[PDB]
Amino acid sequence: ALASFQLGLQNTAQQYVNSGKTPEEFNVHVQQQTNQLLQEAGAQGLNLNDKDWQAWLGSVEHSRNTANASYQDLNLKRAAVLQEQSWGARGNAAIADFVT
Amino acid sequence: KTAQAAQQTASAKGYLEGQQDSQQGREKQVRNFFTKEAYEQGYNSASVNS
Amino acid sequence: MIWMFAAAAAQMIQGGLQYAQDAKNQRRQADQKYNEAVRSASARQITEINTQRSSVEQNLQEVGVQLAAAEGNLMQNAELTELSLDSSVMNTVDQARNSIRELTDWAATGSAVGQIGTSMVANKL
Amino acid sequence: MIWMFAAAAAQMIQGGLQYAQDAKNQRRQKADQKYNEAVRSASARQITEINTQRSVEQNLQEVG
Amino acid sequence: AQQSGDTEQALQNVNSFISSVTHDDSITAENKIKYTSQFVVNAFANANSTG
C-alpha cells in the first residue's frame, strides 16, 4: 500500500498540471488521499510510536513534499513555453499587416 | 483497540500538520509564494497577446 | 553397450511401419474430389464455432501500472532538458530559479545529512 | 575485445534457431489453413465498422 | 526529485528508504545487507550530473 501511494501522488501531480487545475484543488486532493492511508494504517498494526512506524511516517512526509515541490516547477516551465508561443503569434500579425 | 488506534492516528496527523511550522519549513513557504507570482503574470501576458 | 539402445530401437520400429502405410493408402485412391469437399465444408463450420466461442495481489498490479506510467512521464520530460544549451528556455527558467533561491561545497552537505541520517524522526519527536 | 560482444551474440543465437525450426514445420504439411485467413476478413469488416464511422490554445488555433 | 533541481529532497528520499530498511525486525541481517548494498549501488547509476 505504501509503495502504491508513493507512486500515485507523483503520477497525479502531472495529470493535474496538464489540466490547469488551481493549487487549492491539488492541496485538497493531497489531504484527502493522505487521510485514507492514515486511517487504513490504524488497522494494519497498532501504529504504536516505535522505530519502524516512525520511519514509515518519515517516508510518508517526503512522499508528499516531493510532489508538492514538483507541481510548482512544472507550471513554471509551462508558463514560459506559452509566453514564447504567444509572443511569436503576436509577431506574425505585424508582418501580415505590414505586407497588407 | 479502536480507542487506542484513534489517539495514535490523531497524533500522527498532528505531527504531520505541525512539522511545517518549524524552521526549514517556513522558508519553504516563502519559496512557494514567489514561484506563484512568477508564472501568474506570464499567463496573463500570453492571454492578452493571443 | 548394445543393450542400452533397446528401448529407443523398439520405439523407432513403429515409425517405419506407419511411413509405409500412408503410401499404400494414397496409392489405392478419383475419390479425392469427394474427400476435399468434406474438409472444405468442415473448415467453415469449425471457424464459425470458434468465432462464437470467442489484499496484496491487487496493490502489486496497481504498483506495476503506476511505475510504467511514471517512467513514461519522466521520458518526454528529459527531452526538453536535453536542449538546455540551445533553447534559451531552461535559461530563462534557470534565471528565475537562481533569483528565487538566493533568499557551494556539495561534499559538505552529504556528510551533514549522513551524520544524522537514521535518527531524524527520533530526534524530531 | 571478445567480451564486449557477449550480449549481442546471446541475442543473435535465438534468431538462428527459429529460422531453422520454422522451415521444418512447412515440410511436415494445407488447404484448410487458407480458408481461415479468408474468414479473417470478417475481423477487418468488424474493425471497418468503427473505421467506416470515421483559454490560449483556442486562440492559437484560430490565429493559425 | 532532482528533475526539479532539488538535491536535498533526493538525499532525504534516499535516507528515508535506508532507515526504513534498517529498523525492520522481520528480516535477517544478511537480507538487510543485501538490500542496502543493492539500493546504494543502484543509486549511483541514476545521477545526471557531477555535483
For A21-42, the three-class secondary structure string (H helix, E strand, C coil) is: CCHHHHHHHHHHHHHHHHHHCC
Instruction: Find, among C113, C71, A53, the residue nearest to E14 by Cα.
Output: C113
Set of cell numbers at residue A48: 504504536
- Other beta carbons within 10 angstroms of residue E1's beta carbon come to 20
Cβ contact, residue pair C118, E23, below 8 Å? yes
SS3 C28: coil
Cβ contact, residue pair C113, E15, below 8 Å? yes
Nearby residues of E15 by Cβ (< 8 Å), 6 or more positions away: C113, C117, C118, C120
Task: Give the method used.
Answer: cryo-EM
Task: Decide if C124 touches B, using CB distance below 8 A.
Answer: yes
Task: Answer for the pair B12, C78: CB distance below 8 angstroms, yes or no.
Answer: no
Residue with cell 527520533: C122
Q: How far apart are CA D26 and CA A91, in angstroms?
A: 66
Q: C106-114 and E7-23 helices cross at what angle (nearest 10)?
A: 30
List strand residue ranges (DSSP E) for C1-125, in order: none
Instruction: Find, among A68, A18, E42, A7, the residue nearest to C70 by Cα.
Output: A7
Task: Decide if D60 touches A, using CB distance below 8 A.
Answer: yes
Q: How far apart are CA A29 and CA C62, in angstroms?
A: 19
Task: Answer for the pair A56, A37: CB distance below 8 angstroms, yes or no.
Answer: no
Task: Answer for the pair B35, A76: CB distance below 8 angstroms, yes or no.
Answer: yes
Instruction: Let me know the angle formed at the C-alpha of C82 by E16 and C94, rounded to the nearest 5 degrees.
Output: 70
Instruction: Let me know the angle formed at the C-alpha of E9 by C113 and A61, rounded to the nearest 5 degrees.
Output: 100
SS3 D49: helix
Q: How far does CA E2 lie from the centroid of its chain?
A: 14
Tell which of D56, D60, D63 to mutate to test the B interface (max B CBs under 10 Å): D56
How far, in Å, are E3, E34, E42 from residue C90 at the CA level? 12, 39, 28
Task: Answer for the pair E12, A80: CB distance below 8 angstroms, yes or no.
Answer: no
Nearby residues of C4 by Cβ (< 8 Å), 6 or more positions away: none
Task: Answer for the pair A78, A84: CB distance below 8 angstroms, yes or no.
Answer: no
Task: Kindly report the nearest CA distance between residue C83 and chain A, in angstroms.
Answer: 14
Query: Which of C78, C81, C113 is facing E11, going by the closest CB pair?
Result: C113
Q: How far does CA B10 lie from the centroid of its chain?
A: 20
End-to-end CA distance of chain B: 61
Instruction: Find, among B37, C113, B26, E13, the residue nearest to A10 by Cα.
Output: E13
Q: How far apart are CA E42 and CA E36, in angstroms?
A: 10
Residue with cell 468465432: C51
Residue with cell 538487510: E32
Phi, psi of C116 (to 5 degrees): -135, 15
Nearby residues of C118 by Cβ (< 8 Å), 6 or more positions away: E15, E18, E19, E22, E23
Phi, psi of C58 (to 5 degrees): -95, -45
Task: Answer for the pair A31, A64: CB distance below 8 angstroms, yes or no.
Answer: no
Q: D41-53 and D31-39 helices cross at what angle (nearest 10)?
A: 10
Q: How far apart are CA A81 and CA B42, in angstroms?
A: 9
Letter string b/e over residues D22-41, b meaning 16 or more CB atoms within 10 A of that residue's CB: eeeeeeeeeeeeebeeeeee
Tell which of A17, A70, A72, A85 to mutate to test the B interface (max B CBs under 10 Å): A72
Residue with cell 517512467: C71
Residue with cell 484543488: A25
Q: How far does CA C21 lie from the centroid of its chain?
A: 46
Q: Which chains touch D (3 or more CB pairs under 8 A)?
A: A, B, C
Letter string b/e over residues C51-90, b meaning 16 or more CB atoms within 10 A of that residue's CB: eeeeeeeeeeeebeebeebbeeeeeeeeeeeeeeeebebb
> Helices (H) and strands (E) in chain B — how many of each?
2, 0
Instruction: Find, among D22, D38, A73, B10, the residue nearest to C81 by Cα.
Output: A73
